Design a protein around this ligand. Structure first.
Ligand SMILES: OC[C@H]1O[C@@H](O)[C@H](O)[C@@H](O)[C@@H]1O
Lengths: 524, 619
């Protein structure tokens, strides 16, 4: 027998019928009929209606042998019309060569058209781009091109294709999977249509039309299961397809057009996407809460003259306080988990969408790194590992600094020239790695038996290097005053450095010996 | 089982129908006095002008309600007012006209403690719905007696309001007063679900056929069929969009399509009763009714499709039969059913249509569950302790330090200030989560009117918004982003304020903005009202818990530049204190930002300031 329809099955049905009764398919296809019949290059006509503006694309007949002919487009390539479509993960993608060649060979008249369309969208007048077969492919490429620099506040254009071949590869599919652009494409195909999907892959939403109705499939895995074949089927007459859809609306046929197991897949992947949200609203507040706990922890460690770096490191070596243990096991780990995912998410989105997400987390990401990377450094060196800055940094820290460590650092230092520095997070988030490295140098100089005199001179140079580094960030007021807390690893470094460098003097030496650091980082 | 649910009996229904028929013979309305009951029945109209107003330039003849005359018909937190059919609103306006004696009669019935009933057939039923809301706004909310409760009974009425209209009726617990009878195939409740352009050519002919007094215009097969087809097509689009939107899935592709779709805003308001030869089916859920309005008027066979358009006309004249055979029909309440299959099968609802109805009903059950979860959270000790700590430990300690907890938080010199920040952040997460559910309509309509919630949210806003204001200025967000009141104020506090303001002000018929501006002119500044509104644009003086936001914006500025805003803030202060919006133990402290700044004001102001006796200058 049969068991009741699933949730996703009813969505695709309702969405399908919605599109049908909307009249969008009819109005699009009728204008398509006009452009083919009232040398063989790309053609287009513009219909400026009251509700919207419609652009119809027309291309020469599909060459079947050039089915899997692809053109590779790289972000580094200056002849790539879609640089903002590339992502960090996928710096390149491939396009159907005939479609791409038609697109580029019309770059002049399409650039002129882009001016009008972008201005049309600015007046909040929506825009539709459509085409059949290869014309639909070029129509899709043109839509992707419009979305390259478009204002996200503007109404998004809609691309409707009829019986078009596939256009992009797996790389492009993976990109659009993480982009708002993917919701701008409605690919209408007959249920009898089959596509060889060995290289090129589906993107966007597919409207699959049966005699007794149609269904919207967004899941590209399902579209593949439904439409993949060993033969590229020709273009059907969508005049008749739409006609049978109109007769479908007055039909009492609630037939299940989509197979059983295909639905099973769509659902399983749907639930896993409702969790991949990572709730950037709820978890966002969870992050602010955990950061608040860290700030509280940092204040407590300051008041006991240790500093949160060394207190964390100490409790890591010998856990004895529940509050400190909770800070590590819950709040630090929660923050690490979040910001790693944020970095991953930025890297899989096309540059256009990624840039928006980066601006949203500019300040907060910079603040997280400068606050939390010290704690990972503490663990790193407690574990007996070496050379953190060059061999041990977590990827997400490096990316966060790469993205956010150049811009905001200019305005923040502006304020930190007259203001008190009690709350200042040390700008160089690898500061403590430098301290740990220099401690190791000192210990080598003190304990290594039979060390050659030339090796000793090298290590002695390292000490002087670090001292210059320290004095620099002190003079430039780019370091937290908490490094001078009496139980900190920096003050231990100074004590050990003092013993080993002997009778020679310096700017830092006088600064420390006269205890001028007690007045460091005050208002002025 | 019907009467204990709808609050109306067969007697009232029968009398309402009789009056509805009598209303055909009168100007505007008919009044029927039946002992303890007074029934107002409104005259229906069958001209296209009275469904889609000619001067209305919108695609569905819709118009936003005036927030002055219908202050409750809106979303509270969001602010958005409800939308109704303009033609129907104009018709109500025409009967409220003093010359009709309608209002005087209504007021005569109120003083006599009579049960007041509004009713009507067809467009008359639409007027009845609006008249009931008018009554609820003008009289019932001002003095809610059991004697003052109205009843609205309609027969084959068009839809009247939008989703906000329906939502507002639900929040105020007014929906229970409305019962709408619909014969299964009746086209009239479905009409305004169509674009007016979709039926512009065929509506006048069909309305003439729907008119019981018009046996003049010869019946046309073509026109009636086109009309039915046009209405059902647009109805299907609305219903299908609602299906995809209710489940929160496919929001991306729907948003893209929204630029190219014109969908009717009109929604079921109140209880709907669908009728067949053998059944009466009562439904409360507006979403469920919307779906049923499509799927109950379909053909059984594909052979019946030619018959349905004519039956959709005839069923509008079958309410006489409905009323006479009421007690002989099987009744059930769809929302309360353990199984809805039997009811909907008799209503000819398809298998797929039943699942759409079920989903709408399940979503309401989700909303109830969500509220239960919220109650469990906010009643937990671990939650309440956070507010208690701020109130009983943090604030008194900061007062003892003589600077107050706003200033103490802002400089944050001690561990306790960082502890306060944590609890500020934790509370923010819980109230943001509730706000998120509200925004997505995943809580019951009554939620923002729940006094327990209002109490807590008000306690939260008064206690913690000063701390969020401090946090804002502590991190210099006022220089980066701008004024707190303009670009910085968290929406959760705005929701809290409006929920509180609506609760306390609505029995007196005034809205917060009006109350505020009336107090401003009472301060005798002498300046033009238009000029002052420019100055007090985005002022922190509209809400007591925004006291500190205004202080931050006024300090540093020359006196002449912000003289008006200063005297305004002072005039609101005592009532704020009396109402508990502002703590008197805090703001006048020696180390308080407000006090330290207030002294630096010119001596001419301080002398005749109401705050002179509460702060002393330095020496
Ligand atoms: O229980 C009946 C339900 O009817 C709906 O129209 C209201 O919006 C709900 O608040 C109410 O609970």
């Amino acid at each position: 027998s049969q068991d009741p329809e699933s949730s996703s099955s009813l969505k695709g049905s309702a969405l399908g019928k919605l599109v049908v009764t909307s009249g969008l398919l009819h109005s699009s296809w009728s204008k398509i009929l006009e452009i083919h019949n009232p040398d063989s290059g790309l053609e287009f006509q513009i219909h400026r209606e009251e509700k919207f503006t419609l652009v119809v694309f027309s291309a020469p007949p599909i060459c079947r042998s050039s089915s899997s002919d692809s053109t590779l487009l790289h972000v580094k390539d200056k002849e790539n019309p879609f640089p903002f479509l590339c992502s960090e993960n996928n710096p390149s993608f491939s396009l159907h060569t005939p479609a791409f060649n038609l697109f580029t060979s019309a770059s002049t008249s399409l650039t002129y058209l882009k001016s009008e369309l972008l201005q049309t969208l600015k007046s909040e007048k929506p825009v539709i781009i459509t085409g059949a077969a290869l014309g639909g492919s070029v129509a899709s490429l043109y839509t992707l091109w419009l979305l390259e620099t478009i204002e996200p506040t503007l109404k998004r254009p809609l691309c409707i294709t009829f019986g078009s071949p596939l256009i992009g590869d797996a790389s492009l599919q993976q990109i659009l999977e993480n982009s708002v652009r993917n919701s701008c494409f409605l690919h209408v195909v007959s249920a009898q249509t089959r596509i060889k999907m060995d290289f090129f892959k589906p993107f966007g939403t597919f409207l699959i039309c049966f005699d007794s109705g149609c269904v919207c499939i967004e899941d590209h895995v399902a579209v593949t299961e439904l439409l993949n074949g060993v033969h590229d089927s020709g273009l059907v007459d969508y005049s008749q397809v739409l006609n049978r859809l109109d007769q479908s609306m007055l039909s009492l046929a609630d037939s299940r057009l989509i197979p059983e197991d295909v639905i099973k897949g769509i659902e399983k992947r749907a639930e896993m996407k409702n969790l991949r949200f990572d709730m950037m609203f709820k978890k966002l507040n969870d992050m602010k809460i955990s950061m608040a706990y860290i700030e509280w922890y940092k204040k407590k460690c300051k008041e006991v003259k240790i500093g949160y770096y060394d207190r964390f490191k100490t409790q890591l070596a010998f856990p004895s306080k529940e509050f400190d243990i909770n800070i590590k096991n819950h709040h630090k780990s929660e923050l690490n988990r979040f910001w790693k995912s944020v970095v991953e998410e930025v890297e899989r989105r096309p540059q256009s969408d990624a840039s928006i997400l980066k601006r949203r987390f500019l300040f907060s990401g910079n603040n997280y790194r400068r606050m939390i990377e010290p704690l990972d450094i503490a663990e790193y060196y407690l574990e007996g590992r070496k050379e953190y800055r060059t061999t041990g940094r977590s990827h997400h820290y490096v990316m966060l600094e790469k993205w956010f460590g150049m811009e905001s650092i200019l305005i923040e230092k502006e304020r930190c020239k007259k203001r008190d520095l009690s709350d200042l997070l040390t700008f160089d988030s690898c500061f403590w790695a430098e301290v740990e490295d220099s401690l190791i140098v000192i210990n080598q100089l003190n304990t290594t038996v039979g060390m050659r005199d030339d090796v000793r001179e090298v290590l002695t140079r390292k000490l002087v290097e670090f001292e210059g580094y320290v004095w620099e960030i002190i003079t430039k007021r780019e370091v937290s005053p908490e490094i001078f807390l009496e139980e900190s690893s920096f003050m231990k470094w100074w004590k050990e450095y003092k013993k080993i460098k002997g009778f020679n003097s310096s700017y830092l030496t006088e600064f420390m010996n006269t205890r001028k650091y007690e007045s460091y980082g005050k208002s002025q | 089982a019907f009467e204990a649910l709808t609050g109306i009996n067969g007697d009232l229904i029968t009398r309402s129908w009789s009056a509805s028929k009598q209303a055909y013979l009168t100007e505007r309305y008919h009044k029927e006095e039946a002992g303890a009951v007074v029934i107002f029945a409104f005259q229906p109209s069958f001209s296209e002008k009275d469904f889609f107003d000619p001067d209305n330039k919108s695609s569905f003849g819709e118009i936003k309600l005036n927030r002055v005359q219908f202050p409750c018909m809106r979303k509270i937190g969001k602010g958005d007012v409800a939308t109704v059919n303009e033609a129907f609103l104009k018709n109500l306006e025409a009967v409220i006209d003093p010359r009709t004696s309608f209002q005087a009669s209504v007021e005569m019935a109120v003083r006599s403690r009579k049960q007041i009933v509004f009713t009507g057939h067809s467009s008359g039923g639409a007027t009845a719905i609006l008249a009931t809301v008018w009554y609820l706004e003008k009289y019932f909310i001002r003095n809610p007696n059991v004697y003052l409760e109205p009843r609205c009974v309609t027969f084959g009425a068009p839809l009247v309001g939008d989703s906000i209209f329906s939502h507002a009726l639900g929040r105020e617990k007014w929906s229970r007063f409305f019962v709408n009878f619909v014969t299964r195939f009746d086209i009239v409740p479905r009409i305004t679900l169509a674009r007016k352009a979709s039926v512009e050519e065929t509506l006048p002919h069909v309305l003439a056929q729907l008119d019981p007094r018009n046996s003049s215009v010869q019946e046309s097969e073509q026109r009636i069929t086109e009309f039915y087809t046009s209405v059902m097509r647009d109805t299907s689009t609305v219903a299908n969009q609602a299906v995809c939107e209710l489940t929160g899935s496919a929001e991306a592709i729907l948003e893209t399509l929204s630029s190219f779709l014109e969908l009717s805003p009109y929604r079921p308001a109140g209880t709907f009763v669908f009728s067949t030869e053998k059944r009466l089916v009562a439904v409360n859920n507006s979403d469920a009714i919307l779906q049923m309005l499509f799927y109950t008027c379909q053909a059984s066979d594909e052979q019946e499709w030619s018959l349905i358009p004519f039956r959709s006309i005839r069923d509008h004249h079958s309410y006489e039969e409905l009323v006479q055979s009421m007690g002989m029909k099987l009744f059930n309440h769809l929302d309360g059913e353990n199984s809805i299959e039997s009811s909907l099968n008799d209503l000819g609802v398809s298998t797929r249509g039943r699942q759409y109805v079920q989903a709408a009903l399940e979503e309401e059950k989700k909303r109830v569950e969500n509220q239960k979860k919220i109650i469990q959270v906010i009643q937990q000790e671990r939650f309440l302790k956070k507010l208690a700590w701020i109130e009983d430990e943090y604030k008194p300690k900061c007062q003892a330090h003589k600077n107050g907890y706003y200033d103490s938080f802002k400089v944050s010199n001690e561990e306790n200030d960082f502890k306060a920040n944590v609890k500020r952040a934790e509370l923010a997460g819980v109230f943001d989560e509730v706000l998120g559910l509200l925004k997505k309509c995943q809580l019951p309509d009554e939620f923002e009117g729940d006094i327990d919630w209002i109490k807590l949210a008000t306690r939260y806003r008064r206690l913690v918004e000063p701390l969020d204001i401090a946090n804002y200025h502590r991190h210099l967000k006022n220089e980066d982003t701008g004024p707190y009141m303009k670009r910085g104020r968290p929406t959760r506090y705005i929701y809290a304020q409006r929920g509180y303001e609506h609760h306390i002000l609505k029995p007196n018929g005034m809205i917060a903005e009006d109350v505020f501006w009336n107090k401003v002119n009472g301060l005798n500044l002498g300046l033009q009202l238009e000029e002052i509104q420019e100055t007090l644009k985005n002022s922190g003086s509209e809400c007591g818990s925004c006291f500190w936001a205004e202080v931050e914006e006024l300090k540093g500025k020359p006196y002449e530049e912000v003289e008006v805003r200063v005297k305004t803030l002072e005039g609101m202060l005592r009532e704020w204190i009396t109402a508990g919006e502002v703590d008197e133990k805090e703001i006048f402290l020696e180390g308080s930002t407000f006090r330290k700044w207030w002294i630096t004001l010119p001596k001419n102001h301080k002398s005749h300031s109401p705050l002179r006796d509460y702060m002393m200058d330095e020496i």
